[PDB]
Design a protein around this nucleic acid. Structure first.
Ligand SMILES: [K+]
Ligand SMILES: [K+]
Ligand SMILES: [K+]
Ligand SMILES: [K+]
Ligand SMILES: [K+]
Ligand SMILES: [Mg+2]
Ligand SMILES: [Mg+2]
Ligand SMILES: [Mg+2]
Ligand SMILES: [Mg+2]
Ligand SMILES: [Mg+2]
Ligand SMILES: [Mg+2]
Ligand SMILES: [Mg+2]
Ligand SMILES: [Mg+2]
Ligand SMILES: [Mg+2]
Ligand SMILES: [Mg+2]
Ligand SMILES: [Mg+2]
Ligand SMILES: [Mg+2]
Ligand SMILES: [Mg+2]
Ligand SMILES: [Mg+2]
Ligand SMILES: [Mg+2]
Ligand SMILES: [Mg+2]
Ligand SMILES: [Mg+2]
Ligand SMILES: [Mg+2]
Ligand SMILES: [Mg+2]
Ligand SMILES: [Mg+2]
Ligand SMILES: [Mg+2]
Ligand SMILES: [Mg+2]
Ligand SMILES: [Mg+2]
Ligand code: NA
Ligand code: NA
Ligand code: NA
Ligand code: NA
Ligand code: NA
Ligand code: NA
Ligand code: NA
Ligand code: NA
Lengths: 378, 137, 64
RNA sequence: GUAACCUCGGGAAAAGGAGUGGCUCUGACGGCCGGGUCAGAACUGGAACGGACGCGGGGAUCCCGACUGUUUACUAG
RNA sequence: GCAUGAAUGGACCAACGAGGAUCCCACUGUCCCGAGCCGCGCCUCCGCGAGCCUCCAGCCUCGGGAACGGGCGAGGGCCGG
RNA sequence: UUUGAUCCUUCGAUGUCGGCUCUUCCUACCGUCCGCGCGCACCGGCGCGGAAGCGUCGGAUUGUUCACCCGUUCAAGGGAUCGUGAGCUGGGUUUAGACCGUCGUGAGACAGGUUAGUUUUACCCUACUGGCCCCGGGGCCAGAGCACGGCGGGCCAGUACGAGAGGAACGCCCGCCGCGGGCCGCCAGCCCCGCGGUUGCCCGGCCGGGCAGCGCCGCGCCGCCGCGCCCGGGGGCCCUGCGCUGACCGCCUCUAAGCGCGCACCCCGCCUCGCGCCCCGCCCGGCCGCGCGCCCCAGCCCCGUGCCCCGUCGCCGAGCGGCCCCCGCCCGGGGAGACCACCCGGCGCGGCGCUCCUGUACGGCGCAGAGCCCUGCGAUCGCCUGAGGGACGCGCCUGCAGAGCGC
């Protein structure tokens, strides 16, 4: 007979199966669409999650109760040391989909990439690219391959890698990513632009801008094996139940004589590949600037690094980006940033007035160590 | 043709589910009020309706109040609550007791004066409360 | 930010978005720095004998 | 400080209030030196003291059997 | 008064009851709506080491059929452990 | 989806009502969507067709299904062994105790009422949820899954409309609710052995400790978490229809050929998984095969052929196309975790500094101290002292150390 009262199912069936991610890191499945004639630009970057904090801003939002006053907002900091371009890959559109044409590697490759090619660098015999680097000493081979790409490709991407030596991480091998080149008037313009920045650093300042929106892709926090109450959010059973009350009472009808895939069961929770969309950029700066986080209402110079350090993360050494809200993952998890595909239309402009830099280790009340020393008669 | 509160409010942390007994902050003759319903509430299976400061509820007057109002369902507005809530400017605030005032659907009070401080949400949403209030926090 | 408040119980400085405030029936607004302060006040512990507060340091002469 | 009712014996710990630590003192009660108990005061501790332990929740009514007692060892007190 | 009723006892009743029932105060994870934690088991290892059950076997949908098939007819899937 | 009629299967047993929990399906559609009609001025109602995406709630009495009432964003109906007892519960029904009424000579009876009354076993097969049976880096894609709906406010406007009472709509902007995926900066909750307070006993006393299965009380870091915060704006083909051009049928006709517009439904994108493939690197290898005009059929451009020997005697080269081969662990640490796997590695131990948790150490010194049997006893208080103790976060190394066996 029919269920007496109305209620929806619990959980989203579009995120199945709930299994540990088998991809090494967060990967960019799709890139923003390419429109001919727009200025040529890059579409993505890779960084590391560092922390969260406060900001006070001024809201100019016509038609809302916030239109002429202040608001306290949550922000997230992502550490973005420069990336090195090192290869060019071209694709051709085909009846079978996107097929690679060829990939051309630079004459000289840095140690982090070489490390990425092995499992144990100290013991491994160093043979990767040993023959290739002799062939490509002169520019002739590179030119021939780029001519091939110019005459046969439809989509152009570059290959860049991170520099973990500029971070507090323990890892020494780098992360290799493909980044698409959008814009221009033809494929030749794209190929020349990509060739103009080979073996060169790329800064996040040249990819994103303040006030635009981005998508973030990462892997969420892990929890191991978990029960239905926490894994799927079903109701607990009453106290008098024999054999406990954290479970689903009925897991099916008599017919069909099987268990359906739509019924909640226990298993792995967390460590999933996820993507949050439409996050607004608040600030792009570098930790090498002493007035990094000083505004019109402040006096003493304050930088990004808080008093006592970023908890469970080293100190930030260089460039970084600030976004509004939250992103998946814990601290130190690699994060891929990407231009938004379907941005939100009505976003008020960003107008920072004050940034909180107190100690997040405990409850701190001093924005700088000099103020603390003054206070404690030190 | 003006019936309800003014403007559209922001979501606030509710603290008063159906079945709570709250104090009467106006000199209408009542001592305590029993909450039995919330206006503009769409439910869910098994979930009690709940209210916060500034919204309209339906009450009965308790056994320790003047008999002239003792067996009717009446509207009222919540003006104070003990559950701490956060405002859009990042301020967390709370009061010492839960309290309300008997008001009309169109918005005229049923007493002369309101005793104690009143939250700014209720005052902004209802003009009659704003003037009769002696202190707004 | 220039505009900061003072804790009602301990006399320390509070930064934007960092505590809770209470309104009493007598129409007085109290501002607290953390949960430790608000518990001290709620229990009616005299701040003049809690040695880390400003009220106590003034009575001792350490603070002028 | 304790009500209705009552077989005048009860109800009754009805209901419901306040106090209780430490230290320094004062008085009272025997015997031709001992002993504990009871009462009062100052000072002083995060507005704390039956600080662990041990140890009634209460009230207004209706039905049945007066009451203490006995019973289906192993589903009925 | 389907079909109450007088030692097959009628009516009433203070005290009493691990008896059946309704309401009020106080109290609370019973609940809104769940969260965090402690010990033991579970789990992995060394040593020791059973019972029950068992035509044969062990993926589905429809048909017909002792009228609700694992095997039969027609289709759809599936390395093995 | 009722109740009957019948007696085909099941008495060497298919656990017999309802509720709670959870999934899926139907449409004969209650609100929301798109059209048409009205005895449709507006507001509000009523009828018809397509449409099953979302919504269909909280309570009082009853074991109840049902019914009945209060309230709210005003509240359709059903199926799945009358879905769901090795999922629960045990209120009802339906053993054995006991009571009332009616019936019976009696033992006893009663689709009459009432009260008390053990709910056993998974370690096997399958299904389901996760996890494994090592092999480079970066990508692509078949197949499978699938997720943005509802209610308001402001401007339009006291306008159109209407005698008046009254009283809309397109578009844009701003909110709320329900659902979904994340996160910890603020606030809230929690405490592994941190700090402080306190009762009894025990270590002769002070100090400092132990036992009371964490003695009990306050606060609390890294972390987890909600009662906190962030995020959710795309296309296509078209049904039921409304139109354009226009005949059979001299006229008229949305249709018969032809053409346009079109739905919370359908399909695709985004989003989750993903066998297999591709590029590159180390290498530059081995094998197999021999054969290209296009377009239309009421112009069909002169047709109504050709091949017909894959050995049956064909087999070089080139060219073009296709296939095959190629890639470590043990060990330690986590941001990962049942075991495994995954991500990373010249690890870590022990210190020093910063930060922040508690709340001002022991000792000494005081004309401090209520008082006293007073050249001494005394709970407490002040100063040295935001002190002492602690750290699972951050920064350094002045010490000790850390790259070794099976394949
Ligand atoms: K349903
Ligand atoms: K008894
Ligand atoms: K049978
Ligand atoms: K049952
Ligand atoms: K904590
Ligand atoms: Mg039980
Ligand atoms: Mg912190
Ligand atoms: Mg319910
Ligand atoms: Mg008796
Ligand atoms: Mg007895
Ligand atoms: Mg017995
Ligand atoms: Mg018994
Ligand atoms: Mg008779
Ligand atoms: Mg007689
Ligand atoms: Mg009789
Ligand atoms: Mg069988
Ligand atoms: Mg067969
Ligand atoms: Mg069975
Ligand atoms: Mg059986
Ligand atoms: Mg139909
Ligand atoms: Mg069963
Ligand atoms: Mg029973
Ligand atoms: Mg019986
Ligand atoms: Mg599997
Ligand atoms: Mg698909
Ligand atoms: Mg907290
Ligand atoms: Mg002992
Ligand atoms: Mg972990
Ligand atoms: Na079947
Ligand atoms: Na049936
Ligand atoms: Na059934
Ligand atoms: Na059972
Ligand atoms: Na086991
Ligand atoms: Na002790
Ligand atoms: Na979507
Ligand atoms: Na001392």
């Amino acid at each position: 007979s029919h269920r007496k009262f109305s209620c929806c199912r619990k959980g989203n069936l579009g995120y199945l199966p709930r299994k540990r991610c088998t991809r090494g890191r967060g990967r960019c499945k799709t890139f923003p669409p390419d429109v001919q004639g727009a200025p040529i630009h890059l579409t993505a970057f890779l960084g590391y999650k560092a922390g969260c904090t406060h900001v006070m801003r001024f809201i100019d939002h016509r038609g809302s109760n916030l239109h002429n006053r202040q608001a306290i907002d949550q922000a997230t900091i992502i550490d973005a040391p420069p990336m090195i371009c090192t290869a060019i890959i071209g694709y051709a559109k085909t009846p079978k989909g996107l097929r690679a044409v060829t990939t051309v590697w630079a004459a000289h490759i840095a140690e982090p990439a070489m490390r990425r090619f092995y499992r144990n660098y100290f013991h491994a015999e160093k043979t990767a690219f040993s023959t290739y680097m002799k062939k490509a000493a002169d520019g002739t081979y590179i030119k021939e391959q780029l001519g091939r790409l110019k005459q046969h490709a439809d989509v152009i991407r570059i290959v860049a890698h991170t520099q973990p030596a500029l971070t507090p991480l323990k890892q020494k091998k780098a992360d290799i990513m493909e980044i698409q080149v959008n814009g221009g008037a033809s494929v030749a313009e794209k190929v020349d632009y990509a060739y103009a920045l080979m073996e060169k650093p790329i800064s996040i300042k040249d990819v994103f801008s303040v006030g635009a929106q981005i998508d973030t892709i990462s892997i969420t926090r892990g929890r191991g094996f978990e029960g239905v109450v926490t894994r799927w959010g079903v109701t607990r059973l009453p106290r008098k139940t024999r054999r406990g009350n954290r479970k689903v009472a009925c897991i099916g009808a008599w017919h069909p004589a099987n268990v359906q895939y739509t019924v909640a069961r226990a298993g792995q929770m967390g460590y999933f590949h996820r993507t949050d969309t439409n996050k607004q950029v608040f600030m792009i700066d570098t930790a090498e600037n002493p007035r990094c986080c000083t505004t019109e209402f402040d006096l003493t110079d304050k930088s990004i690094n808080p008093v006592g350090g970023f908890v469970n993360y080293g100190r930030v050494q260089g460039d970084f980006i600030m976004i509004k809200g939250t992103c998946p993952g814990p601290k130190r998890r690699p994060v891929v940033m990407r231009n938004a595909l379907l941005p939100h239309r009505n976003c008020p402009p960003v107008q920072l007035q004050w940034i909180s830099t107190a100690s997040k280790f405990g409850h701190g009340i001093f924005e700088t160590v000099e103020e603390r020393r003054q206070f404690y008669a030190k | 043709g003006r019936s309800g509160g003014i403007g559209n409010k922001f979501r606030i942390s509710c603290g008063l589910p159906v079945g709570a007994v709250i104090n009467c902050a106006d000199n209408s003759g009542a001592k305590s009020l029993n909450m039995i319903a919330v206006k503009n509430w769409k439910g869910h299976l098994n979930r009690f309706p709940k209210a916060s400061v500034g919204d309209m509820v339906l009450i009965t007057v308790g056994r320790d109040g003047k008999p002239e109002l003792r067996r009717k369902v009446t509207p009222a507005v919540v003006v104070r609550q003990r559950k701490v809530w956060r405002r859009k400017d990042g301020v967390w605030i709370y009061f010492q007791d839960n309290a309300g005032v008997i008001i009309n659907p169109k918005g005229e009070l049923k007493g002369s004066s309101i005793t104690g401080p009143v939250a700014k949400e209720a005052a902004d949403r209802w003009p009659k409360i704003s003037t009769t209030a002696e202190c707004v926090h | 930010m220039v505009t900061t408040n003072q804790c009602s119980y301990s006399g320390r400085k509070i930064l934007p978005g960092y505590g809770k405030r209470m309104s009493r029936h007598d129409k007085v607004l109290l501002i607290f720095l953390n949960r430790k302060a608000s518990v001290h006040y709620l229990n009616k512990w005299n701040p003049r004998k809690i040695r880390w507060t400003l009220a106590s340091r003034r009575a001792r002469g350490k603070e002028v």
